RNA sequence: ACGAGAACAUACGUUCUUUGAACCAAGCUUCAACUCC
């Protein structure tokens, strides 16, 4: 009922979607072939 | 009752003049605020 969460902002307090949350979202989306797709990746 | 007796190797004189510890060099790279009740 309660606990809320909240969306991201910066100082100016409008909401954003961070580049870092896209980039990873798109790691995921590129690693479904070599899952071994390791540390120092190019 | 000495090749002897006296007799300062002494006086004056800047280790000084000229000179960039400089030059080139991204605190950066890969990184989901997420996971399970």
Redesign the pocket.
């Known amino acids: 009922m309660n606990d809320l969460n909240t969306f ?1 902002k910066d100082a100016f307090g409008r909401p954003y979607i ?1 580049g ?6 798109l ?2 989306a590129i690693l479904n072939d070599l899952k071994e797709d390791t ?3 190019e």
């Not at 870092?20 to 979202?25: E, N, P």
């Open positions: 991201v961070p870092s949350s896209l980039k990873g979202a790691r995921t540390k120092e990746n």
